[PDB]
Design a protein around this ligand. Structure first.
Ligand SMILES: Cc1nc(NC(=O)N2CCC[C@H]2C(N)=O)sc1-c1ccnc(C(C)(C)C(F)(F)F)c1
Ligand code: NA
Lengths: 1026, 266
């Protein structure tokens, strides 16, 4: 069970010397012994020296007339134009090299290799593919690439700098009052640093300015304090300020983060963090030119595939027939003939998750002979088919053994668009290679699943035939549809109910009464534009009459909040107008801040798109190519899934266009990818060949490898995939180690090459982990961050710690290390532990005046995690998965389960309190009081929890939407809307807000065995006490 | 008449639970439950129509219950039986799917045989013990399935790579054949024998190399066939276990419900 992924096929690491077969242009073969780290310049030179000793030498040209070609592990024949590359880095399949004369388009060949390296797949594979939709995509998407690249060079250099180093800022300038009150008379002390010539001295100027100062104003203020010792006319002065105000730019000390834009200073996330923490902002001033010289020149070439030659019509609505589809035969199934009775094919016609008529089975036939030749009739009229209609099918097994009870299991599934991307109604025979059933999915179909034939061709193959109308049939154009709507043709009680329906959450039950009510009042519905998702679900999508009408409404519909618009991109809203509308909202109202925040989900709903080419993908790609911070994560989220064959054609096509237009960042991404690939190889050796060996032996092997020159080259001097603003310099080899945990994670440390790194970010410490699926943690951490943000904006300072977590591949990832923090178990194990050990530890770490602050920080942190883990239903906490910083911040690690996971395997219907505050925590919060729940401190902590809970509940739409967009994501714990039903329970969405709080209090009491009281009367919830 | 004793009145079960019971059922299948609002006296009717579960609110005010504006029915059981004989056309002009097949709770209490709380508790233990064991095995199988799927993908790529490699060594033969043909002819005429042998020696070296690579591919082709067979066998095993596992959970899940049922309640 051990095939190897490494420097060669079947070998992880080339031995220090290796024999390499060289094929000369004259036909001769020469075996050369090479150093595994030797470059191609060296190897070629040695080869041609040696080739003098072999027959037909005279027919060989100058060694500079040739390059090497060979077969790589991806089975591509690859020409090596860059001869500085080391042999061990070539990814050869076998150790041989062929000498050729370089031909063809050299720059394009080189670019394509760089692209293929980034995305994990040779781009020649794309040139192969026959599907019209694919080639159309690769061509048309180039429009988006050119649009962005032009919009980049427009304003140069500034617009190019804005692309590379975007403003990292909050979505609004407005300051919550807990933030504002931290300001001294609405003003902030900032320290501005300059590196002064010749000797690069660091000089410190301290300024007190208005929080809303534009960075240009901050620079003028520094100019004022600088030239103030010198006295001069206030006219020459502010002429001196004016003229030189824009000769400089500001940067954060320690990481590459810039303020290039006239946003208020407190709006930049770094400054806003400094304020809330009472930390000194430290900025570095530098000349605008020394930055704009750093900027690479990005140039975009049209690829050769944009230069190549390529290859009776009736309306859908004139076709008078019922829907009819033929199941012919399946090639094979894997079934145990003795354990199942018969097999058959389930089908359904779906718009989104909803059937447009009831499902239809073929007849049951023996396992051994999967043949039907059955025309299945559906109850719908072909003209009544909506544009997004899909065919959803499965081959199922049926076992009839126990009484009249049967067991139906899906063997394989597939989905088909009833219209293709040219709006052609599908017809004729069709062959569909099917897909494995997703782990945990018990339903006989999988309508959420992607459309299209499984690219693996040894799979069950199901032959179909659709009907033929003796013409090519197209979906009616918009002019036609628009017309048909015009061909169709209390109030205070109604208005209130309408609003009241619109205030509910997405997954709220909508009755048939309410759908008719909604549909009837649909024209007045425009007065409350955010009711749209609910009105859309009231529509009957199997009637062309109602859809045509709904289309005319959408055309003129007022935009809605992105947080709302995003629901329209989930798997429940397949219609191309509807999604278009949703995307135009994001275009108008979605800040880059929110786009970064929600990027995980927006990428995921791309899996739900019926076609490669759509408004959503164009918008995202465009954003990714005009903002490099968005571009970075855009790339890593797509690349991390490229192993998954359901999405890999789509994502690879998207990754190709992105890598063509992204510019010089491609060189940086490739350095990151190369660094991760050495970490994957290294940890694979540890987990495979070295799996039975001691830590000491393994630590000797890790050290000896990391000193290797090819390893140093690759792991030093690149940007961190967790935060590309963090530069990873030289390794600190002495702090690198294999952690004791089961999957053998690596603890890594890098110098921060930043000249100012002492002020902030002196260490970059990262855990590289191979073998666990990090997608669930990553989501959870993201949800925690979105929660923290919600609370801040309400003036609730609950300090969460959503540490960096990034999935880069199949079960491989990076975790950002939190400094100066230990687990509760680690704490108890130093300084014999009673319940008071923790509070004693926290005391020893904060002595004197700073003691109170540490308690305050531990209390707030505590509150936040108590509330969040309740709501999300995180896996149960213990002393190993809870951590505490020396200054008292508490946070959770290792989430790895959430929602309804426990109910599935234990069948208990309950809401857990995952984080139960043991006496140890109550002691800390109470500052060591004897009776901990009776202190005013603990009342304070309760009110925090209460506030935090209702804030999230008020935002329930957002969270529910975010989870809904993950349904097709492959996360076993979130497979359908039932998994999301959990947070509807913990947030008590079907109750009143006051009822919900009562419920939350009750959960806390049941879990903590009393001690959660109320400052309110039972009846009105009004302040009684104090 | 007794609504509590009604066959299709299921009380406080969640929407999800009703979904499970209505899963893939024929049109006309219905049950009534408490509203999700839990407001004491509102109930929600759930009707199966056209592959979809409808939700129909049952309005409770004064003395009478109903769908539409004119509360025409004095009790819940009145309404359901008066929609059980007829179509649904008088709630709405459209529809008219009636109410046909109910969901009974009594065929479900069939499956727990035992009366006392001790026998039920003992069987719950047994099922739940079997359940965690079978789950663990199905998960082990699914990892093996996954691992194997990947390894097969690796090997397929590696056979392709062998193909490309072999072509290239075969082209080298052909290239050698073209050049060396004219040289050995002329060389013979110039009487140099051991230079000819050097060319033939390199040609032997090339051809035996080709034989190695082809046989190494041959072996990998064998390994793939074997694994492809194991992968299908792991797929077979999973397809037997899966349906039995679902039914096992459903049994356990209602023994737990039964155990709750006669047992002290709030
Ligand atoms: C965010 C974070 N920060 C840390 N910091 C320290 O461990 N420190 C900090 C200094 C000493 C040392 C310690 N506590 O002894 S660990 C950590 C983390 C988060 C999530 N999972 C993990 C592991 C180890 C389970 C994983 F996944 F990598 F295997 C670690
Ligand atoms: Na430094």
């Amino acid at each position: 069970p051990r095939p190897s992924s490494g420097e060669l096929w079947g070998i992880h690491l080339m031995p220090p010397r290796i024999l390499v077969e060289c094929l000369l242009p004259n036909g001769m073969i020469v075996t050369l012994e090479c150093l595994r780290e030797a470059t191609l310049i060296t190897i070629k030179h040695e080869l041609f020296k040696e080739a003098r000793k072999y027959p037909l030498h005279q027919l060989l040209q100058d060694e500079s007339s040739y390059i090497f070609v060979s077969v790589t592990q991806e089975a591509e024949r690859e020409e090596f134009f860059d001869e500085t590359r080391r042999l061990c880095d070539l990814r050869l399949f076998q150790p041989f090299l062929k000498v050729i004369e370089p031909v063809g388009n050299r720059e394009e060949k080189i670019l394509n290799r760089e692209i293929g390296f980034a995305i994990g797949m040779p781009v020649c594979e794309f040139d192969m593919v026959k599907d019209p939709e694919v080639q159309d995509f690769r061509r048309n998407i180039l429009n988006v690439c050119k649009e962005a690249v032009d919009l980049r060079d427009l304003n140069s250099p500034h617009s190019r700098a804005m692309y590379v180093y975007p403003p990292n800022v909050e979505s609004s300038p407005e300051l919550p009052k807990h933030i504002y009150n931290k300001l001294d008379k609405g003003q902030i002390i900032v320290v501005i640093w300059v590196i002064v010539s010749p000797n690069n001295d660091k000089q410190k100027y301290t300024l007190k300015i208005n929080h809303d100062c534009v960075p240009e104003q901050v620079i003028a203020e520094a100019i004022r304090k600088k030239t103030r010792s010198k006295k001069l006319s206030s006219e020459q002065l502010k002429l001196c300020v004016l003229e030189y105000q824009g000769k400089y730019i500001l940067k954060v000390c320690g990481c590459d983060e810039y303020f290039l834009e006239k946003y208020p200073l407190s709006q930049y996330k770094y400054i806003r963090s400094c304020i809330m923490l009472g930390r000194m902002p430290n900025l570095m001033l530098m000349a605008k030119e020394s930055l704009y010289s750093q900027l690479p020149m990005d140039c975009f070439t049209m690829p050769s595939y944009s230069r190549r030659i390529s290859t009776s019509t009736k309306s859908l609505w004139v076709i008078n027939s019922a829907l009819r589809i033929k199941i012919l035969c399946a090639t094979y199934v894997n079934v145990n003939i003795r354990d199942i009775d018969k097999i058959y094919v389930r089908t359904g016609i779906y718009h989104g998750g909803e059937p447009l008529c009831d499902n239809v089975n073929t007849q049951r036939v023996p396992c051994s002979n999967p043949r039907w030749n059955e025309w299945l009739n559906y109850d719908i009229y072909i003209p009544d088919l909506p544009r997004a209609a899909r065919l959803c099918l499965s081959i199922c097994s049926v076992k009839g053994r126990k009484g009249a009870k049967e067991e139906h299991c899906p063997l394989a599934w597939g989905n088909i668009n009833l219209f293709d991307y040219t709006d052609t109604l599908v017809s004729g025979k069709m062959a569909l290679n099917l897909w494995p059933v997703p782990h945990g999915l018990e339903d006989l179909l999988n309508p959420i699943g992607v459309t299209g034939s499984n690219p693996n061709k040894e799979t069950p193959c199901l032959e179909l035939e659709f009907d033929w109308f003796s013409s090519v049939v197209k979906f009616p154009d918009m002019s036609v549809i628009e017309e048909h709507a015009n061909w169709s043709v209390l109030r205070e009680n109604d208005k209130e109910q309408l609003k009241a329906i619109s205030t509910r959450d997405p997954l709220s039950e909508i009755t048939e009464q309410e759908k008719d009510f909604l549909w009837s009042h649909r024209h007045y519905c425009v007065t409350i534009p955010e009711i749209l998702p609910k009105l859309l679900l009231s529509v009957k999508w199997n009637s062309r009459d109602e859809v045509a009408q709904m289309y005319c409404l959408v055309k003129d519909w007022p935009p809605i909040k992105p947080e709302q618009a995003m629901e329209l991109l989930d798997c429940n809203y397949p219609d191309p107008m509807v999604r278009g509308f949703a995307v135009r909202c994001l275009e108008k109202y979605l800040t880059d801040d929110k786009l970064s925040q929600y990027l995980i989900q927006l990428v995921q709903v791309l899996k739900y798109e019926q076609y490669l080419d759509n408004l959503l993908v164009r918008f995202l790609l465009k954003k990714a190519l005009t903002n490099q911070r968005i571009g970075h994560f855009f790339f890593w989220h797509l690349k991390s899934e490229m192993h998954n064959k359901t999405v890999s054609q789509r994502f690879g096509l998207l990754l190709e266009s992105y890598c063509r237009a992204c510019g010089m960042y491609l060189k940086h991404l490739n350095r990151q990818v190369e660094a991760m690939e050495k970490l994957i190889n290294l940890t694979d050796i540890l987990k495979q060949e070295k799996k039975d060996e001691t830590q000491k032996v393994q630590m000797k092997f890790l050290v000896e490898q990391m000193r290797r020159p090819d390893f140093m080259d690759a792991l030093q001097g690149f940007l961190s995939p967790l935060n590309p603003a963090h530069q990873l310099g030289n390794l600190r080899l002495e702090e690198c180690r294999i952690m004791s945990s089961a999957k053998r994670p690596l603890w890594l440390n890098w110098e921060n090459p930043d000249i100012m790194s002492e002020l902030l970010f002196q260490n970059n410490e990262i855990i590289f982990k191979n073998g666990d699926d990090l997608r669930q943690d990553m989501l959870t951490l993201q949800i925690i961050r979105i929660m923290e943000n919600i609370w801040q904006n309400q003036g609730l300072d609950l300090r969460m710690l959503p540490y960096g977590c990034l999935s880069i591949g199949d079960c491989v990832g990076l975790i950002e290390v939190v400094r100066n923090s230990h687990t509760i178990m680690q704490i108890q194990c130093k300084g014999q532990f009673n319940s008071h050990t923790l509070h004693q530890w926290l005391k020893d770490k904060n002595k004197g005046e700073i003691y109170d602050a540490a308690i305050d920080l531990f209390t707030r942190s505590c509150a936040g995690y108590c509330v969040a883990t309740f709501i999300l239903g995180i896996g149960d906490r213990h002393n190993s998965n809870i951590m505490v910083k020396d200054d008292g911040q508490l946070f959770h690690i290792d989430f790895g389960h959430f929602l309804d996971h426990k109910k599935k395997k234990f069948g208990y219907k309950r809401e857990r309190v995952p984080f139960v505050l043991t006496q140890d925590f109550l002691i800390v919060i109470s500052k060591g009081a004897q009776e901990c729940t009776k202190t005013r401190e603990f009342e304070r902590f309760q009110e925090m929890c209460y506030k935090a809970y209702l804030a999230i509940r008020q935002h329930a739409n957002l969270f529910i939407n975010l989870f809904s967009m993950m349904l097709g994501s492959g996360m076993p714990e979130l497979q359908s809307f039932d998994d999301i039903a959990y947070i509807r329970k913990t947030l008590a969405l079907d109750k009143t807000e006051q009822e919900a709080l009562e419920y939350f209090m009750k959960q806390m009491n049941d879990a903590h065995h009393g001690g959660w009281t109320t400052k309110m009367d039972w009846i009105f919830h009004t302040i009684k006490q104090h | 008449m007794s609504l509590q004793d009604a066959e299709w009145y299921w009380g406080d079960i969640s929407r999800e639970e009703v979904n499970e019971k209505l899963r893939d059922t024929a049109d006309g299948t219905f049950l009534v439950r408490d509203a999700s609002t839990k407001m004491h006296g509102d109930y929600t009717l759930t009707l199966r129509k056209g592959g979809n579960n409808k939700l129909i609110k049952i309005f409770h005010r004064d003395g009478k219950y109903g769908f539409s504006d004119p509360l025409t029915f004095s009790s819940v059981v009145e309404l359901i039986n008066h929609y059980r004989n007829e179509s649904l056309a008088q709630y709405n002009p459209k529809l008219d799917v009636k109410l046909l097949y109910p969901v009974s709770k009594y065929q479900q209490d069939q499956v727990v045989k035992e009366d006392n709380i001790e026998a039920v508790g003992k069987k719950l233990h047994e099922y739940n013990t079997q359940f965690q064991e079978k789950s663990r095995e199905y998960d082990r199988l699914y990892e093996e399935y996954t691992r194997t799927s990947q390894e097969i993908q690796m090997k397929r790529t590696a056979i392709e790579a062998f193909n490309e490699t072999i072509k290239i060594f075969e082209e080298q033969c052909q290239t050698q054949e073209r050049y060396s043909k004219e040289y050995i002819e002329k060389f013979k005429r110039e009487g140099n024998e051991k230079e000819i042998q050097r060319i033939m020696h390199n040609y032997d070296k090339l051809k035996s190399r080709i034989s190695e690579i082809i046989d190494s591919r041959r072996r990998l082709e064998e390994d793939l066939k074997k694994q492809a067979a194991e992968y299908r066998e792991i797929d077979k095993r999973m397809n037997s276990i899966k349906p039995d596992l679902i039914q096992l959970r459903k049994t356990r899940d209602q023994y737990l419900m039964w155990l709750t049922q006669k047992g002290v309640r709030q």
